[PDB]
Symmetry: C3
């Protein structure tokens, strides 16, 4: 609805996670305020050009990592991106690994998730009177997944092509007994705190959303358990590789997602009562 400055539009949105507070990537950056019915997004959205494509960057934790996962205004964030006209959303996230072969420094492009959050307050945009139940069997946008995998391959980085993300509430990390459940019982591959309800809202807004995850740690399974400082250090050390992948992929997103490879692109057709 209202933006300041007025008239700003973008085509691709990038949501930065741990370690990614600035868009080193955009040219001609303008900071934009976007009105939402839910109040403030995490920070200003930075809009600029990447090889002729207009990109909107939002740090989910705000600049300086000021907002922990449970306190993020997920509704405002996704509303603001949708209001700017974006069709594609790339999320860049730090995750823990629950398997030896998904190693620190590897990328993962997950294809499934399990929601073990509890305190996020709103899991939908739709509280009535139109009841909306989106289908999320295949919750990520395949068109964008495949493009991230291809970019990673071309640049020579390791990119695991599948993975189930278990989303936990936090902010504490898991106990050993919990980690054993995630790994041995649920057979999840990676773990983080921020995917839900971000992905649910992206789907409801009919966006093509995918996650580019970077493994930062092995959860409770190494000699030393994960610490926050380790996650941050690992991300900051590798942010250059994530930036290179974004510069590779974004120019290829000049067009529209293919409907047959975008499960949420027409989610509301069959979902609203």
């Amino acid at each position: 609805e209202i933006t300041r400055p007025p008239g700003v539009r973008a085509h691709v949105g990038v949501i930065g996670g741990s370690g990614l507070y600035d868009p080193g990537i955009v040219e001609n950056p303008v900071e934009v305020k976007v009105s939402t019915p839910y109040g403030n997004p995490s920070d200003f959205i930075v809009v600029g050009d990447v090889a002729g494509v207009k990109v909107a960057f939002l740090p989910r934790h705000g600049r300086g990592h000021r907002i922990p996962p449970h306190a993020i205004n997920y509704r405002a964030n996704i509303w603001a991106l949708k209001a700017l006209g974006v069709k594609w959303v790339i999320s860049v996230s730090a995750v823990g690994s629950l398997r030896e072969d998904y190693r620190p420094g590897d990328f993962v492009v997950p294809d499934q998730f399990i929601d073990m959050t509890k305190n996020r307050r709103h899991y939908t945009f739709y509280d009535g009177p139109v009841t909306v139940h989106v289908s999320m069997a295949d919750p990520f946008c395949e068109d964008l997944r495949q493009r991230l995998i291809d970019s990673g391959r071309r640049l020579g980085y390791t990119v695991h092509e599948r993975g189930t993300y278990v989303c936990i509430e936090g902010p504490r990390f898991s106990t050993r007994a919990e980690s054993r459940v995630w790994k041995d019982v649920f057979k999840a591959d990676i773990i983080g705190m921020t995917l839900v309800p971000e992905i649910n809202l992206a789907c409801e807004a009919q966006l093509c959303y995918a996650t580019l995850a970077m493994v930062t740690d092995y959860d409770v399974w190494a000699d030393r358990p994960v610490t926050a400082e380790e996650v941050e250090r690992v991300m900051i050390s590798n942010v250059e590789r994530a930036r290179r992948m974004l510069y590779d992929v974004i120019p290829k997103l000049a067009g529209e997602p293919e409907l047959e490879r975008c499960s949420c692109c027409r989610a509301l057709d069959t979902a609203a009562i």
Copy 2:
């Protein structure tokens, strides 16, 4: 406490789920407002006669399916039914199946549940200073379960005589990875969104509550995953069968539940500290 019109009482309550917004079933219908300490119930309660038994009908989603599962005022709904004097509560619900032999169009009368909700805000009526911990090992009222099973048999419908209901938060449906957990790990039979905390509150109010579930879909396991429109279509197509079962069962509920086959009928005796 206060009702408008004044003096209205009922013996059986029916909570209608998806597809069941009107009580085609009652005669001499009066719309009733019932005061509750929790504000508005989902809609007016309709009170009328079914073969000499006074029945109170409440659509949990409101008329026109205006209230999604996470936004229902469960406390107000159950308080209002209790205030009218009801002893028996039949819930009619749409569920998904996690097993091939529980097929779309079949009825299920579940005997257990697993609560995987997270955002329902109140799971009890008792916040102190009297602490109440009801026993819910066998959470449904057996007297009423057995009567529903018998009615279904007599009318010639398929009624599965047991089943564990996994209650999920929604409003989105499950991912494939989540559905695999419900089915393969938890070994649940059916899935829905509305049972909790409705059943907890019914037990605390010492009501005899049972669910008549209708299978509308196979969750994420068919060629096509579940959509909201499919659930609604399937329910509306079969609502006649549900109405026939209610007309059969309600006249047999002229009496009181048998205490030895009503786990919650004296729940508060041993539960309050």
Copy 3:
């Protein structure tokens, strides 16, 4: 910050659970009000002497068991203990058993937990702008665990030396289908309602916290399922044994926890961003 009376300090904190509303244990008891940014703790804190060590006792449910698990102001409780200067926290709790050999009347000193709560509203003290993710792989303080185990042995009581606690939301007890999940799928040992988020907050405050649990029931697995009255009766019958253990252990806590056996004692060093 502000206390009334002013100037009160304590070294050991004891949080009493079900059945333990008074500190039969302390001498020279003074009731203390401690300001917190979160409002009222469960009750006054009672401060007094046990063989030369200053002890602060707080009943988590308040006197008279007025506050059920979901309504406890966990932040206020832990803030108030920290403000008084305590370094050690002993929690005394009633738990259910999920295994035949952990019998009613036995003590358990758990070493792990699984959090299955959903409605506790705040799981941390840190909502930003400093983001804090504490490591809780080994969530209890080992120094204090070992001292409780030793005391139990010396007095001749059965004390199980390990156990995974599954924390459920309540206030209703588990269904049979849920209990089967806790026992057979998650392989938990004991069950209760109060550990989370108490333990998370204790860790964030850099306290040495451990639980002395008493088994009061076998959950849904005996001839009769658990009832609230049974739990209370069993605790009140055995509170003398718990008091004897506290009198044995507290004089040995005159010193400081050993850092190498206190996982949370420097939790914030690596946890804050």
